[PDB]
Design a protein around this nucleic acid. Structure first.
Ligand code: MG
Ligand code: MG
Ligand code: NA
Ligand code: NA
Length: 137
RNA sequence: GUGGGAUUGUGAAGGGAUCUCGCAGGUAUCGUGAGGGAAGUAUGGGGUAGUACGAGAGGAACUCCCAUGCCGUGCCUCUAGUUUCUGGGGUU
């Protein structure tokens, strides 16, 4: 797909990462973490923090990492979350950590490698991440 | 008419008289539905299609069908939270 709007292409996933969450960066661009600024395709409700889950594209800034990647608004895709979600086949699953990868607004991954497993939901929404994943889980 | 009560405050006991009230409904279901309230609402993807239009750059929509926000009404199989079952352990 690699299209910014993903909600109508993937099933319900429990929201894990509200605005202000800091998640690890799984790529090798040089960034260490990502600061969730907002979530693509989020429709607001009064007082509700925009919250990301797997496969979502987020706006982010880099808080720790090499200087050229910092002090900017970047795009990123969530690939792991600690909050558990229920898959349609009934299985409840979660990751040990939260992680994301830096992308351009059209879904192309900056960086050429991914550390750790990628959720199947995220990989189905984004083929480039899927090809770079060392395991789809 | 029948019954039961009662008259105004200065004893007692019997007589009337006059009022007032009751005299037919209880109890248990299934329904009607006047009137009132009132609620669903959006986005995306597939396909149409890279085609109609267009020199070209670019570039649509509906039958359909697949999701997802929000809102609403519930529920507790699962997963999560909660424990004064102070349940069972452990430990100062
Ligand atoms: Mg507020
Ligand atoms: Mg319980
Ligand atoms: Na009515
Ligand atoms: Na439990």
């Amino acid at each position: 797909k690699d299209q910014a709007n993903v909600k109508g292409c993937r099933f319900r996933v429990s929201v894990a990462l509200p605005v202000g969450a800091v998640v690890n960066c799984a790529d090798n661009t040089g960034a260490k973490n990502l600061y969730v600024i907002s979530v693509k395709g989020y429709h607001g409700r009064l007082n509700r923090l925009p919250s990301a889950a797997l496969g979502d594209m987020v706006m982010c800034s880099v808080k720790k990492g090499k200087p050229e990647l910092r002090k900017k608004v970047l795009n990123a895709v969530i690939i792991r979350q600690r909050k558990s979600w229920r898959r349609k086949d009934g299985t409840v699953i979660y990751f040990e950590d939260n992680a994301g990868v830096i992308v351009n607004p059209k879904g192309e991954m900056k960086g050429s490698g991914i550390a750790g497993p990628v959720a199947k939901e995220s990989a189905d929404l984004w083929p480039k991440i899927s090809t770079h994943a060392p395991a789809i889980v």
